[PDB]
mmCIF file of all heavy atoms in Angstrom:
data_model
loop_
_atom_site.group_PDB
_atom_site.id
_atom_site.type_symbol
_atom_site.label_atom_id
_atom_site.label_comp_id
_atom_site.label_asym_id
_atom_site.label_seq_id
_atom_site.Cartn_x
_atom_site.Cartn_y
_atom_site.Cartn_z
ATOM 1 N N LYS A 57 -1.208 7.444 -28.052
ATOM 2 C CA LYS A 57 -2.592 7.163 -28.299
ATOM 3 C C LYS A 57 -2.974 5.729 -27.973
ATOM 4 O O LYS A 57 -2.198 4.795 -28.194
ATOM 5 C CB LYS A 57 -2.922 7.429 -29.790
ATOM 6 C CG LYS A 57 -3.037 8.936 -30.121
ATOM 7 C CD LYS A 57 -3.402 9.174 -31.567
ATOM 8 C CE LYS A 57 -3.914 10.617 -31.759
ATOM 9 N NZ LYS A 57 -3.616 11.212 -33.096
ATOM 10 N N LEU A 58 -4.172 5.576 -27.402
ATOM 11 C CA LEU A 58 -4.671 4.275 -27.018
ATOM 12 C C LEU A 58 -6.102 4.137 -27.537
ATOM 13 O O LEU A 58 -6.990 4.851 -27.111
ATOM 14 C CB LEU A 58 -4.666 4.134 -25.486
ATOM 15 C CG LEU A 58 -4.950 2.701 -24.994
ATOM 16 C CD1 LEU A 58 -4.357 2.481 -23.620
ATOM 17 C CD2 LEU A 58 -6.444 2.476 -24.972
ATOM 18 N N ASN A 59 -6.301 3.226 -28.486
ATOM 19 C CA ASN A 59 -7.607 2.999 -29.071
ATOM 20 C C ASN A 59 -8.422 2.040 -28.177
ATOM 21 O O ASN A 59 -8.101 0.866 -28.067
ATOM 22 C CB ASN A 59 -7.419 2.405 -30.477
ATOM 23 C CG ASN A 59 -8.714 2.257 -31.223
ATOM 24 O OD1 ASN A 59 -9.625 1.592 -30.750
ATOM 25 N ND2 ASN A 59 -8.785 2.828 -32.415
ATOM 26 N N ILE A 60 -9.425 2.588 -27.519
ATOM 27 C CA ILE A 60 -10.215 1.748 -26.612
ATOM 28 C C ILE A 60 -11.029 0.606 -27.229
ATOM 29 O O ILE A 60 -11.479 -0.288 -26.500
ATOM 30 C CB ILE A 60 -11.190 2.600 -25.768
ATOM 31 C CG1 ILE A 60 -12.136 3.366 -26.669
ATOM 32 C CG2 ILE A 60 -10.408 3.569 -24.877
ATOM 33 C CD1 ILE A 60 -13.272 4.053 -25.903
ATOM 34 N N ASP A 61 -11.210 0.610 -28.543
ATOM 35 C CA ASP A 61 -11.947 -0.499 -29.180
ATOM 36 C C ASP A 61 -11.000 -1.702 -29.285
ATOM 37 O O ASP A 61 -11.415 -2.836 -29.116
ATOM 38 C CB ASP A 61 -12.422 -0.123 -30.609
ATOM 39 C CG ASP A 61 -13.617 0.814 -30.605
ATOM 40 O OD1 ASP A 61 -14.312 0.929 -29.596
ATOM 41 O OD2 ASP A 61 -13.855 1.443 -31.681
ATOM 42 N N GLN A 62 -9.727 -1.405 -29.583
ATOM 43 C CA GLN A 62 -8.753 -2.440 -29.696
ATOM 44 C C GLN A 62 -8.120 -2.777 -28.331
ATOM 45 O O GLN A 62 -7.410 -3.736 -28.208
ATOM 46 C CB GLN A 62 -7.660 -2.021 -30.664
ATOM 47 C CG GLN A 62 -8.171 -1.286 -31.875
ATOM 48 C CD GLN A 62 -7.042 -0.899 -32.821
ATOM 49 O OE1 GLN A 62 -6.000 -0.409 -32.380
ATOM 50 N NE2 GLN A 62 -7.253 -1.110 -34.113
ATOM 51 N N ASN A 63 -8.383 -1.935 -27.343
ATOM 52 C CA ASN A 63 -7.835 -2.078 -26.011
ATOM 53 C C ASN A 63 -8.854 -1.633 -24.966
ATOM 54 O O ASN A 63 -8.724 -0.550 -24.376
ATOM 55 C CB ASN A 63 -6.536 -1.285 -25.860
ATOM 56 C CG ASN A 63 -5.519 -1.642 -26.939
ATOM 57 O OD1 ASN A 63 -4.877 -2.668 -26.887
ATOM 58 N ND2 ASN A 63 -5.341 -0.760 -27.928
ATOM 59 N N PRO A 64 -9.894 -2.445 -24.704
ATOM 60 C CA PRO A 64 -10.957 -2.161 -23.749
ATOM 61 C C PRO A 64 -10.597 -2.259 -22.291
ATOM 62 O O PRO A 64 -11.394 -1.913 -21.422
ATOM 63 C CB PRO A 64 -12.032 -3.186 -24.152
ATOM 64 C CG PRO A 64 -11.206 -4.368 -24.504
ATOM 65 C CD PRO A 64 -10.134 -3.724 -25.375
ATOM 66 N N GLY A 65 -9.398 -2.755 -22.015
ATOM 67 C CA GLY A 65 -9.000 -2.909 -20.612
ATOM 68 C C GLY A 65 -8.378 -1.771 -19.851
ATOM 69 O O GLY A 65 -8.548 -1.708 -18.617
ATOM 70 N N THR A 66 -7.705 -0.834 -20.520
ATOM 71 C CA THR A 66 -7.072 0.291 -19.822
ATOM 72 C C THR A 66 -7.988 1.351 -19.243
ATOM 73 O O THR A 66 -7.845 1.687 -18.026
ATOM 74 C CB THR A 66 -6.064 1.010 -20.784
ATOM 75 O OG1 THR A 66 -5.223 0.039 -21.436
ATOM 76 C CG2 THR A 66 -5.167 1.954 -19.966
ATOM 77 N N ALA A 67 -8.877 1.877 -20.031
ATOM 78 C CA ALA A 67 -9.788 2.946 -19.569
ATOM 79 C C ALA A 67 -10.407 2.638 -18.193
ATOM 80 O O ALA A 67 -10.312 3.473 -17.275
ATOM 81 C CB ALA A 67 -10.891 3.158 -20.608
ATOM 82 N N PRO A 68 -10.987 1.446 -18.018
ATOM 83 C CA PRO A 68 -11.578 1.122 -16.694
ATOM 84 C C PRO A 68 -10.586 1.137 -15.545
ATOM 85 O O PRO A 68 -10.961 1.374 -14.388
ATOM 86 C CB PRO A 68 -12.203 -0.246 -16.924
ATOM 87 C CG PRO A 68 -11.369 -0.817 -18.006
ATOM 88 C CD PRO A 68 -11.145 0.337 -18.960
ATOM 89 N N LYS A 69 -9.303 0.910 -15.806
ATOM 90 C CA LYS A 69 -8.319 0.940 -14.724
ATOM 91 C C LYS A 69 -8.158 2.371 -14.152
ATOM 92 O O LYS A 69 -7.774 2.491 -12.972
ATOM 93 C CB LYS A 69 -6.959 0.446 -15.201
ATOM 94 C CG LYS A 69 -6.897 -1.044 -15.445
ATOM 95 C CD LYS A 69 -5.480 -1.414 -15.872
ATOM 96 C CE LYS A 69 -5.400 -2.917 -16.169
ATOM 97 N NZ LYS A 69 -4.048 -3.244 -16.778
ATOM 98 N N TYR A 70 -8.417 3.381 -14.947
ATOM 99 C CA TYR A 70 -8.234 4.764 -14.490
ATOM 100 C C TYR A 70 -9.526 5.519 -14.345
ATOM 101 O O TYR A 70 -9.543 6.767 -14.317
ATOM 102 C CB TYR A 70 -7.302 5.528 -15.443
ATOM 103 C CG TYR A 70 -5.931 4.903 -15.550
ATOM 104 C CD1 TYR A 70 -5.669 3.959 -16.513
ATOM 105 C CD2 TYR A 70 -4.925 5.181 -14.629
ATOM 106 C CE1 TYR A 70 -4.461 3.246 -16.515
ATOM 107 C CE2 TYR A 70 -3.706 4.511 -14.636
ATOM 108 C CZ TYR A 70 -3.473 3.545 -15.584
ATOM 109 O OH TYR A 70 -2.320 2.833 -15.626
ATOM 110 N N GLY A 71 -10.653 4.807 -14.244
ATOM 111 C CA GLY A 71 -11.951 5.468 -14.063
ATOM 112 C C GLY A 71 -12.346 6.348 -15.242
ATOM 113 O O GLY A 71 -13.016 7.362 -15.018
ATOM 114 N N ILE A 72 -11.971 5.984 -16.451
ATOM 115 C CA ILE A 72 -12.337 6.779 -17.614
ATOM 116 C C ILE A 72 -13.727 6.306 -18.117
ATOM 117 O O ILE A 72 -13.884 5.193 -18.623
ATOM 118 C CB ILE A 72 -11.309 6.668 -18.709
ATOM 119 C CG1 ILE A 72 -9.980 7.237 -18.196
ATOM 120 C CG2 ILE A 72 -11.805 7.393 -19.978
ATOM 121 C CD1 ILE A 72 -8.876 7.285 -19.203
ATOM 122 N N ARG A 73 -14.724 7.185 -17.998
ATOM 123 C CA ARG A 73 -16.078 6.885 -18.431
ATOM 124 C C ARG A 73 -16.292 7.070 -19.940
ATOM 125 O O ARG A 73 -16.824 6.194 -20.609
ATOM 126 C CB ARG A 73 -17.067 7.729 -17.673
ATOM 127 C CG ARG A 73 -17.280 7.298 -16.239
ATOM 128 C CD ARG A 73 -18.554 7.903 -15.749
ATOM 129 N NE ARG A 73 -18.569 9.341 -15.930
ATOM 130 C CZ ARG A 73 -19.653 10.042 -16.314
ATOM 131 N NH1 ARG A 73 -20.791 9.417 -16.537
ATOM 132 N NH2 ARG A 73 -19.565 11.344 -16.467
ATOM 133 N N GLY A 74 -15.933 8.248 -20.443
ATOM 134 C CA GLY A 74 -16.133 8.540 -21.852
ATOM 135 C C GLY A 74 -14.905 9.090 -22.520
ATOM 136 O O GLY A 74 -13.853 9.280 -21.882
ATOM 137 N N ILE A 75 -15.005 9.359 -23.785
ATOM 138 C CA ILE A 75 -13.901 9.912 -24.538
ATOM 139 C C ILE A 75 -14.436 11.100 -25.314
ATOM 140 O O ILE A 75 -15.613 11.213 -25.546
ATOM 141 C CB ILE A 75 -13.267 8.848 -25.467
ATOM 142 C CG1 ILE A 75 -14.272 8.398 -26.519
ATOM 143 C CG2 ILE A 75 -12.836 7.653 -24.645
ATOM 144 C CD1 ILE A 75 -13.776 7.216 -27.322
ATOM 145 N N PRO A 76 -13.530 12.006 -25.756
ATOM 146 C CA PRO A 76 -12.061 11.885 -25.535
ATOM 147 C C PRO A 76 -11.643 12.189 -24.086
ATOM 148 O O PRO A 76 -12.290 12.925 -23.348
ATOM 149 C CB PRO A 76 -11.494 12.911 -26.493
ATOM 150 C CG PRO A 76 -12.715 13.508 -27.216
ATOM 151 C CD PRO A 76 -13.844 13.316 -26.276
ATOM 152 N N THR A 77 -10.526 11.571 -23.704
ATOM 153 C CA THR A 77 -9.987 11.813 -22.368
ATOM 154 C C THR A 77 -8.463 11.899 -22.528
ATOM 155 O O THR A 77 -7.859 11.170 -23.271
ATOM 156 C CB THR A 77 -10.356 10.695 -21.370
ATOM 157 O OG1 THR A 77 -11.760 10.718 -21.116
ATOM 158 C CG2 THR A 77 -9.609 10.884 -20.070
ATOM 159 N N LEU A 78 -7.895 12.842 -21.748
ATOM 160 C CA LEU A 78 -6.470 12.992 -21.783
ATOM 161 C C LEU A 78 -5.907 12.812 -20.341
ATOM 162 O O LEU A 78 -6.437 13.392 -19.381
ATOM 163 C CB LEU A 78 -6.082 14.390 -22.301
ATOM 164 C CG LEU A 78 -6.414 14.599 -23.764
ATOM 165 C CD1 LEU A 78 -5.849 15.957 -24.238
ATOM 166 C CD2 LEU A 78 -5.779 13.501 -24.615
ATOM 167 N N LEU A 79 -4.917 11.979 -20.277
ATOM 168 C CA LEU A 79 -4.245 11.685 -19.016
ATOM 169 C C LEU A 79 -2.752 12.004 -19.204
ATOM 170 O O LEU A 79 -2.141 11.562 -20.171
ATOM 171 C CB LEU A 79 -4.431 10.201 -18.688
ATOM 172 C CG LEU A 79 -5.457 9.861 -17.601
ATOM 173 C CD1 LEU A 79 -6.743 10.607 -17.753
ATOM 174 C CD2 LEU A 79 -5.705 8.338 -17.605
ATOM 175 N N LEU A 80 -2.219 12.823 -18.312
ATOM 176 C CA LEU A 80 -0.813 13.213 -18.392
ATOM 177 C C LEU A 80 -0.078 12.451 -17.287
ATOM 178 O O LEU A 80 -0.369 12.630 -16.094
ATOM 179 C CB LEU A 80 -0.657 14.722 -18.233
ATOM 180 C CG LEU A 80 0.746 15.286 -18.123
ATOM 181 C CD1 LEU A 80 1.542 15.022 -19.391
ATOM 182 C CD2 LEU A 80 0.644 16.779 -17.821
ATOM 183 N N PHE A 81 0.896 11.632 -17.693
ATOM 184 C CA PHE A 81 1.716 10.850 -16.762
ATOM 185 C C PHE A 81 3.090 11.455 -16.514
ATOM 186 O O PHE A 81 3.649 12.149 -17.380
ATOM 187 C CB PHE A 81 1.872 9.428 -17.305
ATOM 188 C CG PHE A 81 0.648 8.549 -17.150
ATOM 189 C CD1 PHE A 81 -0.337 8.515 -18.119
ATOM 190 C CD2 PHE A 81 0.495 7.723 -16.030
ATOM 191 C CE1 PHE A 81 -1.441 7.681 -18.012
ATOM 192 C CE2 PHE A 81 -0.612 6.882 -15.897
ATOM 193 C CZ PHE A 81 -1.592 6.885 -16.886
ATOM 194 N N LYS A 82 3.635 11.191 -15.338
ATOM 195 C CA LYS A 82 4.953 11.634 -14.957
ATOM 196 C C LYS A 82 5.555 10.450 -14.228
ATOM 197 O O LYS A 82 5.266 10.199 -13.069
ATOM 198 C CB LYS A 82 4.888 12.847 -14.063
ATOM 199 C CG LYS A 82 4.625 14.158 -14.764
ATOM 200 C CD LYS A 82 4.276 15.277 -13.819
ATOM 201 C CE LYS A 82 3.976 16.569 -14.522
ATOM 202 N NZ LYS A 82 5.204 17.200 -15.143
ATOM 203 N N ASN A 83 6.396 9.680 -14.937
ATOM 204 C CA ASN A 83 7.004 8.467 -14.458
ATOM 205 C C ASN A 83 6.053 7.609 -13.671
ATOM 206 O O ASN A 83 5.988 7.699 -12.435
ATOM 207 C CB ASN A 83 8.323 8.731 -13.713
ATOM 208 C CG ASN A 83 8.118 9.519 -12.432
ATOM 209 O OD1 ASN A 83 7.705 10.675 -12.460
ATOM 210 N ND2 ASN A 83 8.411 8.885 -11.295
ATOM 211 N N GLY A 84 5.254 6.822 -14.404
ATOM 212 C CA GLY A 84 4.313 5.883 -13.797
ATOM 213 C C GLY A 84 3.037 6.344 -13.125
ATOM 214 O O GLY A 84 2.265 5.506 -12.686
#
């Protein structure tokens, strides 16, 4: 889990406009 209020920098790196959003990663 990543709280965007406490971490406003990540979402914009992956083009996340709104929430909730789920991103599934596979080694990086």
Side-chain angles (χ1 to χ4, degrees):
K57 283 182 163 149
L58 189 156
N59 185 304
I60 60 170
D61 286 341
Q62 320 181 315
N63 304 285
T66 311
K69 288 181 181 172
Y70 302 89
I72 298 184
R73 287 198 306 141
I75 63 189
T77 292
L78 293 187
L79 256 45
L80 172 64
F81 284 88
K82 281 168 181 289
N83 65 295

